[PDB]
Design a binder for this molecule. Structure first.
Ligand SMILES: COc1cc2c(cc1OC)CN(C=O)CC2
Ligand SMILES: COc1cc2c(cc1OC)CN(C=O)CC2
Ligand SMILES: [Mg+2]
Ligand SMILES: [Mg+2]
Ligand SMILES: [Mg+2]
Ligand SMILES: [Mg+2]
Ligand SMILES: [Zn+2]
Ligand SMILES: [Zn+2]
Lengths: 324, 323
């Protein structure tokens, strides 16, 4: 079984990794084993002098703080966003663009970006006067919490994977990670996409043909949209993966809608298991959110992501075909 | 208790004897000044606030300002409340703000520094504090002030908004959050630029009363109004101003002592062995306080003239104390 797991982890550089199989083969440790594999593949333990036992201890604690009883926003989702970011970081249009520290920030941000997610939306937490929404003044409630947990866990016994970074390195990494995870709040999507389109329309490329990003604002904006793309990458995956993600998000949505219906609240969009159209909701999600984003990312790295965009468009056609 | 009532008759005036009221009230200036302002604006009848609930909340809120913090305590909170109360009655702002916006501005003022530890956001970030960890280094204190102010409403007989509709509560909450987050000094320059923009394009009646049609402009004015109240010490009668300066320097110096003991770089104006209190006040007026208050004065022209005159008198006096 360990041999089969190792075989599957050989696909870590590929879009469409068998992440649900890896979750089973690893004993529900997909985040730990995929993060470890990526850190080895990118030589990050050597570069940042991360003790392997410290990395594994932190990853297992982080993974533990994802909720195993939440259908979508769990450790498998985290592992999936990590691996998807890892693939996007390797796109030819970004070769030698980002530093090792920026690469570390994007991958760490992906790993922590939904930690301790309770399986309900920001709007639900606000409308129910939750302790989280009270702590965070209704503003990026979950995303602020994911950051606070992800950073706090570094202080647990033998968990500081950044113990050998310089002070300036730690300061820079912390700021970049905060900037990246806060950009996963869907309330920021429209402004984030508008900005990404502006960068595409004005983009500069070097003599080697890679993106020229010569200031923090442009560099962090690319990393923010990269992780946001990874977070919204399910409909761009092979259909057997995409359908499992759809099954999971609908279960999570329906459980929230059951709580809203109980409380006499208006049921959130797509959360009513008695008045649901899963297929129409996927086509709308793709048409208004996922394809606008991924078409713009594909434009930024053109033509690196053409196959990913082609898969998204095929999956949209497939879901659309199940309506009439 | 009769002299206390005598002092409170100036509640509508710039320069209220807030330190005298703090002493006469048994260190309850926030409670008695908030209560006075709520009665004077009839906010209890307008919003069906039981007087026992108001007093209970106000005492609990006041209890969560630190008595061993020289500046950011309940006297400062009461001062900002009462200052906001006066600025809300600016004639050039007549008919601008709804009753809920007025309640939001006054409530925001009361909670805007609650549970302040007497050290800056940068100190909290640099010492890897639990507060900075919770709030991801962003408006750390101001997020905490809001969280405490609202959490205290859930204490027994403390929900002063219990007879507001759900929609009214949601609207007030958003406004209060927007106002208190704007008291973070790292937002001052952007706030001032937006106040300036509003001054350049301001629309008034023939009588010179401001016309603010959209919520974005109205919340910007309320943010700058409470920010002005927060930064109003140099605009008060000099005797009050000098007491505030003594307190902020005591607080700054206590921060610099903690920084020195920890081996940290001492924050500006926080080194008691290398301070220039008077030069610092002149620079603070010249670069922060006067630009803000003269822009505010342009917005409400001529209603802020006496306040601006006091500020300029006080700047001249502090400069004269520099040899
Ligand atoms: C796979 O389908 C979806 C995935 C996700 C959403 C919606 C979807 O379909 C309508 C919205 N999100 C909320 O957290 C992000 C993930
Ligand atoms: C009375 O003098 C001052 C007051 C205040 C500051 C600085 C001052 O002088 C230099 C800065 N602030 C920090 O919280 C607001 C209050
Ligand atoms: Mg999220
Ligand atoms: Mg403050
Ligand atoms: Mg109108
Ligand atoms: Mg005069
Ligand atoms: Zn996510
Ligand atoms: Zn203040």
């Amino acid at each position: 079984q360990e041999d089969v797991l190792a075989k599957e982890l050989e696909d870590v550089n590929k879009w469409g990794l068998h992440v649900f199989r890896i979750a089973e083969l690893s004993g529900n440790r997909p985040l730990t084993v995929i993060m470890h594999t990526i850190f080895q593949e990118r030589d990050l333990l050597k570069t940042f002098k991360i003790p392997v036992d410290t990395l594994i201890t932190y990853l297992m604690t982080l993974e533990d703080h994802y909720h195993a009883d939440v259908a979508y926003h769990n450790n498998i989702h985290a592992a999936d966003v990590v691996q998807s970011t890892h693939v996007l970081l390797s796109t030819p249009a970004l070769e030698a663009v980002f530093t090792d520290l920026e690469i570390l920030a994007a991958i760490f941000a992906s790993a922590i970006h939904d930690v301790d997610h309770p399986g309900v939306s920001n709007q639900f937490l606000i409308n129910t006067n939750s302790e989280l929404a009270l702590m965070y003044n209704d503003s990026s409630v979950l995303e602020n919490h994911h950051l606070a947990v992800g950073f706090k866990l570094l202080q647990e016994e033998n968990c500081d994977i950044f113990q050998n970074l310089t002070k300036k390195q730690r300061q820079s990494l912390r700021k970049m990670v905060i900037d990246i995870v806060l950009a996963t709040d869907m309330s920021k999507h429209m402004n984030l996409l508008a900005d990404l389109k502006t960068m595409v329309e004005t983009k500069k490329v070097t003599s080697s043909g890679v993106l020229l990003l010569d200031n923090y604002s442009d560099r962090i904006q690319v990393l923010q949209n990269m992780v946001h793309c990874a977070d919204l990458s399910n409909p761009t995956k092979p259909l057997q993966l995409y359908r499992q993600w759809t099954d999971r998000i609908m279960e999570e949505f329906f459980r929230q809608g059951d709580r809203e219906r109980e409380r006499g609240m208006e049921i959130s969009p797509m959360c009513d298991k008695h008045n649901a159209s899963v297929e129409k909701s996927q086509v709308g999600f793709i048409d208004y959110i996922v394809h606008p984003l991924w078409e713009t990312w594909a434009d930024l790295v053109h033509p690196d992501a053409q196959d990913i965009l082609d898969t998204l468009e095929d999956n949209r056609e497939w879901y659309q075909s199940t309506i009439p």
